[PDB]
Design a protein around this nucleic acid. Structure first.
Ligand SMILES: Nc1nc2c(ncn2[C@@H]2O[C@H](COP(=O)(O)OP(=O)(O)O)[C@@H](O)[C@H]2O)c(=O)[nH]1
Ligand SMILES: [Mg+2]
Ligand SMILES: [Mg+2]
Ligand SMILES: [Mg+2]
Ligand SMILES: [Mg+2]
Ligand SMILES: [Mg+2]
Ligand SMILES: [Mg+2]
Ligand SMILES: [Mg+2]
Ligand SMILES: [Mg+2]
Ligand SMILES: [Mg+2]
Ligand SMILES: [Mg+2]
Ligand SMILES: [Mg+2]
Ligand SMILES: [Mg+2]
Ligand SMILES: [Mg+2]
Ligand SMILES: [Mg+2]
Ligand SMILES: [Mg+2]
Ligand SMILES: [Mg+2]
Ligand SMILES: [Mg+2]
Ligand SMILES: [Mg+2]
Ligand SMILES: [Mg+2]
Ligand SMILES: [Mg+2]
Ligand SMILES: [Mg+2]
Ligand SMILES: [Mg+2]
Ligand SMILES: [Mg+2]
Ligand SMILES: [Mg+2]
Ligand SMILES: [Mg+2]
Ligand SMILES: [Mg+2]
Ligand SMILES: [Mg+2]
Ligand SMILES: [Mg+2]
Lengths: 703, 205, 82, 85
RNA sequence: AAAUUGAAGAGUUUGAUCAUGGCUCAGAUUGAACGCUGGCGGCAGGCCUAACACAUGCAAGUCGAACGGUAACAGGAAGAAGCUUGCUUCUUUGCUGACGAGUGGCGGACGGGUGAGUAAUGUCUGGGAAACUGCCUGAUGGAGGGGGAUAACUACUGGAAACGGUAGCUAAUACCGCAUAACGUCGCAAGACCAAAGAGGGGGACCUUCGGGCCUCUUGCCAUCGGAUGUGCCCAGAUGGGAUUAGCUAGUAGGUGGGGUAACGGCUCACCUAGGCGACGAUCCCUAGCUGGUCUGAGAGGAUGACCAGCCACACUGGAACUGAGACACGGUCCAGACUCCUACGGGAGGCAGCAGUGGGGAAUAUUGCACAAUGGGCGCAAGCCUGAUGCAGCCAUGCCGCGUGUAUGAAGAAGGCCUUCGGGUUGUAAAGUACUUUCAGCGGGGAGGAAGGGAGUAAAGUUAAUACCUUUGCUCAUUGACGUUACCCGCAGAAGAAGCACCGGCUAACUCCGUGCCAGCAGCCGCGGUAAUACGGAGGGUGCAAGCGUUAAUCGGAAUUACUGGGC
């Protein structure tokens, strides 16, 4: 039945900052597990993981791809373990892709660069891992690049991210002279071989260029893994060194609780270091049953609604980490079975969506490539064609299984732009595409606000929104140019009041009736009422027919409803009919509303209203070094501010800025803050602004 | 598929009694049955040839509780059949199961007979039929099922089935809850006001 | 191999086969040389469930026509002993 | 291919090789008889006809050609050799 | 016996009339679409356009009772693993069940698809002669004897794969000669010539080289004449429009001889004649699969060829063939093209108009489903295996049919609406209220039939030489249904969960008010609206149909308006 025992299952992720070596290392992995014949390189576009056309050209990974391998060991020490690796993007534009993937993975290998180490996306992913609480190990790649420091990078992790790291392999030699690594357990040096692409290596004599720090850090290591129990410590404090095996099992334990992180160093591009990390993925990372069970909600919660022992015997339960788009079936849902067995054709129940789904073609994957499999065991990551309702993060399970899994949380789109097919009428074709791609990214949203006719596309980043646009030109092909969102202006009287009036000679003898009103304008104030359509009924001269005395404010609503000044609605405006004229035979309503319409028109000009644009309450966090520049930029924009507040890990800025303003604020923020800031817009009360555009957009139609 | 509305509206639109009500109270005392149901019913629309044909056809449809589809079928058959088209049509209309139920009691109205047929409260020769259009065959017995027998409504309908022209083709048993269909009604065994030839020309127009 | 097989006419969930002597190539419902009686599988009534045409079946099987499994079973049942 | 109709492809090729062998041999014997008949030696042509006859009849038996084709060869050749004198 | 019994008009030219004449409406029908609305069941239906391009998954295998054999599982055999001479399981042995790959046989030409091509090489009807036909069936026989290979395999080897090399082999129902065969072929005759294959089951012997030999039966093999079947061929009639297509044709028409075909044939070659077709429409051009039938019609006729069935044709485009009884071959070969995919860059793979499905095009057409339980089909001694045939299920009011959405009662003829001559009327027994029922939906429980068979045991005979072993025909036994939470039946609760669409000037059934004022708008036709609009919009009311309604599109009718029936100058 089960090809590989659950204990011989590793589900790992490669998350790190941009260009940290995450994709290259997976290529070295696909090479040193024999699954791929050529090592490859990203700049050449050769990398398999980047299958997407954009990813090949830009070298960027714009999606997470999952692949598996069998690393028996570096010495064929173990029977082949199936390492499920989910390589992830590190571009903050695509942040769902790391988190969508992160909940599913059991362990994380977080890459770092020896020149830089912790860089901004690196903290971002660290935070993501902490929320899904993945036990982590680390690979510090680029140790073949000047500025390379294993030691310094370790400190960087401790100083910045917050993690306390235990060295596993120190480094033999400098950046150009990176011969290989020194284990702090085997006490060996795996000097790799240049002629072969790292395929062969030699365990060596631990030379004196580096034989002394090794002792210090080996000693520092024992102490920390020995920091797992007094049974180790009583012997450790017995002055005796505990066995490496007790250290390695102790190591696996400390990683599970996240007490320590294990740091491995190598150079994927230099084809060195990669084979050992794949070995240490076996050594400390968690197997599906090497930690406690998935938990659940049952029937609005229970004592232990789900304590699903990940097993080939427990009832089927899963999570759809990702929905992806395939043009021929129309979807591909990536699922990890937390507990259970599912087979081709098996029905599943969408615990979250309360529905029935049939799994038509379960497949396994090598990035883009897919291999159909009849059944999926627990702890296996697979892609399911034939599933049409599962949202990213929605549990798919057998009936009577947990309703809710922990992955119900996702980021908020930060950039908004609008789009138009060249052909004005390809708008639905364009529209459907935006929708499909919106299913795949819970972070790409398409809402065509009905205030204006514009199609609005919201996304986590400027690249994302562009990577999300070339996909439309390429798949679901449409040609579309992006632009600016429209303007949601409004208006209100300032203070002026009169006894204005309107009148048509509806009689003429033959016509037979007429209507006329004397009105009285006032504003309330910008934001005193919930009911912007304020009013007072007074009339006691020319008292219009009674059966529609109260029915003569709602017909007037259709002026406050939209557009008196420049095609923009009114707020807080108060109308007051006091006099008028009529005759109670049949005072025609549809031709009496002309009196009301000219009453509004004349009333508006005399009252000198104003125009108030949309302005919101922005809230920003940023490092306490970029305050001057972020506030200077807010100042360049028409922004007021709110809070003289400084956080402890930064500074919380509060600012009132326009809504037509701040187009592309996020990218400007990242630019001037070193991609280390977030923000939000609260849609606060509208405020007036002197604008050359408010009248040029109605003088566009002139009179 | 059933006219759920004011039956007396229909009746006084026809002017005549469609018997869409039980005999508990007179027709005038329940509805002002001389004027059309409208606010302009007091007025008089001068008749047209189509007018009287449609009105007779609708009278028959409203009497028997049949809709225009399946009434066109009751004409298609009895046009295919042999004999007089209109007579065969009236026979095919009296053969309906709610019809024979009504004419044998068990329901004071065709709609009560429809509910009787539909609620599996009837048994054409033991076999529970619940198709209100079941064209009952001669030499056949329709029997009320037990638990439908002795319900309050069936008894009242058996009692009220008198004061009415006794059908020359039924042989009810009134409490034993049997009732036969000894032979199909011929022409003269019915109201004789229904001019079936009008309907025939309506449908052959 | 001219067969004598059932032809599966009727309706959904209510079959009614027709014993047809047809070349074994043509489709079940398709072309046939001659029909020799019918067979109603679902009949549970006074009306005859099956009826064959034995003199012509014998003519065919003397000309070498193969008899299907159910048509053999129906010749059995037509005979009193079976 | 797709199915195991590739096996039939191999078998058809092999049978074509063999049939071409035998059909070439048979047609060569008939070429001999025709060259004799256009040479005029009724007795040499007769020997050639009696040499081809068992070949062509054996081939017809094998199925490489038809009984009718073998008989047609023999009839044509008898007619020719008889008018050959 | 019955197999029919069937034919309707109206509006509109006019100040009015009668004719002529067109337009329009009333009907029936649809693979429909759109709008609004939508409860259920049954049976059907479902890419009409791009024969446009196709990812993926299935759509053709089977036989160990032809053979060499042993890759996988199992049974055993020898154990000096495991061990308490083992129940606590080590390897070798095809030995046996069995079986991957391989040789071989049969199938793969069926079934499934689409209608591009095809105006006649096709189809339909009716005849005909110059033919072949696997499997199926009948009749008579044979079924001696022998050889050389060859895959699989071993070796070495090459390749990324696909897929190979190069020697050594190893069988056969694979191949080949011989012997033998005549109511078989050729030949007027004489005469000459042609085939084969064996496998399985048990057994009284009795013989061995535990190979078996031998006796049987069960199948299989070769030949010939038959049948059935299927197929090929010929003929006549009929089968579209255009003459704003009148000449066309040179293998062309025929004759002779050779060749070819299963078969006749310019089918073909070489001569020879100069014919042949054509106003009964040749030739060309456009269009088109044809038929039973479908719609319509009183008919005659008109339109059509979705479903279903018969024939034809095509398989990405063009060509050729090979194997074979059958093909010039959907899921075979080769080549040329365009296209797509794989590649380690050296090469390689493919053809959804099979079933689902995607894109696209379009007003518009469904699931990447479940079983082979039925019936068929291939293989097989069977068991069985395979079947996107087929049976079922899903989606969609797409159609037809059936049912429900309550029934009886109920005059303060309520309130409210609307009209009003201000009295009232209408909504309206309508509601509410009262009584009763619970179809269907929803829960819960029972539960046919599609299931025949097949298999194991049994007995009887037939069987032989033998109560074995095979049949065949009964008896018993356990059983086989995807649909399926089946149909249907029973109980539970309560009128709860279930009504909309169009219309109301005349044609045409069904009217008032208000607001509007030749505006906005309506209109199938006539026409409506410029101050009292039943023609627009709303409201109240009414009429028709109803889980549909209306609109658009399409066919016939009405239209005697292409008049053959059945018209006119
Ligand atoms: N010098 C050096 N370059 C490296 C190393 N690993 C990866 N790279 C290069 O870094 C660039 C981006 O690496 P990649 O793995 O695509 O980045 P990611 O996909 O963002 O992790 C590529 O050019 C790699 O060649 C290394 O160890 N040393
Ligand atoms: Mg780059
Ligand atoms: Mg990358
Ligand atoms: Mg209906
Ligand atoms: Mg299958
Ligand atoms: Mg085998
Ligand atoms: Mg079709
Ligand atoms: Mg040999
Ligand atoms: Mg042989
Ligand atoms: Mg000749
Ligand atoms: Mg013509
Ligand atoms: Mg065509
Ligand atoms: Mg006519
Ligand atoms: Mg195509
Ligand atoms: Mg051939
Ligand atoms: Mg084929
Ligand atoms: Mg195909
Ligand atoms: Mg379209
Ligand atoms: Mg079968
Ligand atoms: Mg009133
Ligand atoms: Mg029910
Ligand atoms: Mg049984
Ligand atoms: Mg059964
Ligand atoms: Mg009228
Ligand atoms: Mg209208
Ligand atoms: Mg119309
Ligand atoms: Mg008016
Ligand atoms: Mg005519
Ligand atoms: Mg005339």
């Amino acid at each position: 039945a089960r090809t590989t025992p659950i204990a011989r299952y590793r589900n790992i992720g490669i998350s790190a900052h941009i260009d940290a070596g995450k994709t290259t290392t997976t290529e070295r992995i696909l090479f040193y597990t024999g699954v791929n014949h050529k090592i490859g390189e990203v700049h050449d576009g050769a990398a398999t993981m980047d299958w997407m056309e954009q990813e090949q050209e830009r070298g960027i990974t714009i999606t997470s791809a999952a692949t598996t391998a069998f690393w028996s060991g570096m010495a064929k020490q173990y029977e082949p373990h199936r390492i499920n690796i989910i390589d992830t993007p590190g571009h903050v534009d695509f942040t769902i892709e790391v988190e969508r993937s992160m909940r599913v993975l059991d362990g994380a290998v977080m890459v770092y660069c020896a020149v830089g180490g912790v860089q901004p996306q690196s903290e971002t992913v660290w935070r993501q891992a902490n929320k899904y609480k993945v036990p982590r190990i680390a690979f510090v790649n680029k140790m073949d690049r000047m500025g390379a420091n294993f030691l310094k990078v370790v400190n960087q992790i401790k100083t910045r991210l917050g993690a306390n790291p235990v060295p596993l392999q120190l480094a033999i030699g400098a950046e150009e002279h990176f011969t290989g690594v020194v284990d702090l357990v085997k006490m060996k040096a795996i000097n790799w071989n240049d002629a072969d692409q790292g395929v062969t290596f030699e365990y060596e004599d631990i030379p004196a260029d580096m034989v002394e720090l090794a002792n210090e850090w080996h000693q520092n290591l024992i102490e920390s893994a020995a920091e797992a129990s007094e049974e180790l410590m009583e012997k450790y404090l017995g002055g005796e060194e505990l066995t490496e095996a007790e250290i390695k099992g102790a190591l696996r334990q400390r990683v599970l609780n996240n007490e320590i992180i294990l740091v491995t160093c190598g150079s994927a591009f230099k084809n060195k270091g990669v084979q050992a990390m794949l070995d240490a993925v076996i050594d400390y990372l968690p197997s599906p049953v090497d930690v406690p069970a998935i938990n659940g909600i049952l029937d609005d919660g229970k004592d232990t609604p789900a304590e699903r022992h990940a097993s080939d015997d427990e009832p089927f339960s899963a999570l759809a980490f990702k929905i992806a788009t395939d043009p021929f079936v129309g979807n591909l849902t990536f699922f990890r079975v937390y507990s259970g067995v599912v087979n081709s054709g098996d029905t599943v129940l969408n615990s979250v969506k309360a529905a029935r789904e049939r799994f038509g073609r379960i497949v396994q994957m090598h990035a883009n490539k897919r291999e159909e499999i009849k059944e999926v065991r627990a702890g296996d990551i697979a892609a399911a064609i034939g599933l049409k309702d599962v949202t990213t993060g929605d549990t798919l399970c057998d009936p009577d299984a947990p309703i809710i899994l922990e992955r119900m949380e996702f980021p908020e789109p930060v950039i908004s732009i609008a789009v138009e097919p060249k052909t004005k009428a390809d708008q639905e074709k364009m529209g459907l595409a935006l929708g499909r791609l919106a299913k795949e990214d819970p972070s790409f949203r398409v809402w065509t606000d009905e205030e204006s006719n514009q199609t609005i596309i919201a996304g986590m980043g400027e690249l994302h929104l562009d990577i999300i646009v070339d996909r439309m030109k390429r798949e679901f092909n449409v040609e579309a140019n992006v632009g600016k969102p429209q303007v949601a202006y409004r208006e209100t009287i300032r203070q002026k009041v009169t006894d204005v009036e309107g009148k048509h000679a509806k009689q003429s003898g033959g016509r037979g009736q007429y209507g006329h009103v004397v009105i009285d304008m006032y504003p309330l104030e910008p934001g005193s009422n919930p009911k912007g359509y304020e009013f007072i009924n007074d009339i006691k001269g020319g008292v219009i027919p009674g059966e529609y005395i109260p029915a003569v404010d709602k017909g007037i609503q259709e002026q406050l409803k939209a557009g008196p000044l420049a095609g923009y609605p009114v707020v807080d405006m108060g109308i007051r009919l006091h006099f008028g004229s009529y005759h109670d035979v049949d005072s025609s309503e549809l031709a009496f509303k002309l009196a009301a319409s000219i009453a509004f028109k004349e009333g508006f000009k005399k009252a000198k209203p104003v125009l108030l644009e949309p302005i919101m309450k922005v809230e920003v966090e940023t490092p306490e070094e970029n305050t001057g520049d972020v506030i200077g930029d807010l100042s360049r924009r028409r922004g007021m501010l709110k809070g003289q507040e400084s956080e402890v890990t930064g500074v919380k800025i509060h600012a009132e800025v326009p809504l037509s303003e701040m187009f592309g604020y996020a990218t400007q923020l990242r630019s001037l803050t070193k991609g280390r800031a977030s923000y939000t817009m609260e849609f606060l009360k509208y405020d007036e602004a002197p604008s050359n555009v408010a009248q040029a957009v109605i003088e566009a139609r002139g009179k | 598929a059933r006219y759920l509305g004011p039956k007396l509206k229909l009746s006084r639109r026809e002017g005549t009694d469609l018997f869409l009500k039980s005999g508990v109270r007179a027709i005038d005392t329940k509805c002002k049955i001389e004027q059309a149901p409208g606010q302009h019913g007091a007025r008089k629309p001068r008749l047209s040839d189509y007018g009287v044909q449609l009105r007779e056809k609708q009278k028959v449809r409203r009497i028997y509780g049949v809709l225009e589809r399946q009434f066109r079928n009751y004409y298609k058959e009895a046009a295919r059949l042999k004999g007089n088209t209109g007579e065969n049509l009236l026979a095919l209309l009296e053969g309906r199961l709610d019809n024979v139920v009504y004419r044998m009691g068990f329901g004071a109205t065709r709609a009560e007979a429809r509910q009787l047929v539909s609620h599996k409260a009837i048994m054409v020769n033991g076999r529970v039929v619940n198709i209100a259009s079941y064209q009952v065959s001669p030499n056949d017995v329709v029997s009320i099922r037990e638990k439908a027998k002795k319900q309050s409504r069936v008894k009242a309908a058996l009692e009220l089935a008198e004061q009415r022209e006794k059908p020359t083709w039924l042989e009810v048993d009134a409490g034993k809850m049997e009732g036969t269909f000894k032979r199909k009604p011929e022409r003269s065994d019915l109201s004789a006001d229904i001019n079936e030839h009008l309907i025939v020309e309506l449908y052959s127009k | 191999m001219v067969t004598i097989r059932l032809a599966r006419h009727g309706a959904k969930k209510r079959p009614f086969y027709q014993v047809v002597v047809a070349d074994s190539r043509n489709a079940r419902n398709g072309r046939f040389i001659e029909r020799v009686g019918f067979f109603n599988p679902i009949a549970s009534e006074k009306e005859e469930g099956t009826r064959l045409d034995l003199d012509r079946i014998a003519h065919w099987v003397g000309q070498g026509a193969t008899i299907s499994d159910r048509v053999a079973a129906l010749i059995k049942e037509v005979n009193k002993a079976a | 291919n797709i199915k195991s109709a590739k096996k039939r492809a191999i078998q058809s090729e092999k049978a074509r090789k063999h049939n071409a062998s035998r059909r070439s041999m048979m047609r060569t014997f008939i070429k001999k008889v025709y060259a004799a008949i256009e040479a005029g030696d009724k007795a040499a042509a007769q020997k050639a006809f009696n040499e081809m006859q068992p070949i062509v009849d054996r081939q017809a038996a094998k199925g490489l050609i038809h009984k009718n084709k073998a008989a047609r060869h023999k009839a044509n050749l008898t007619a020719q050799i008889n008018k050959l004198a």
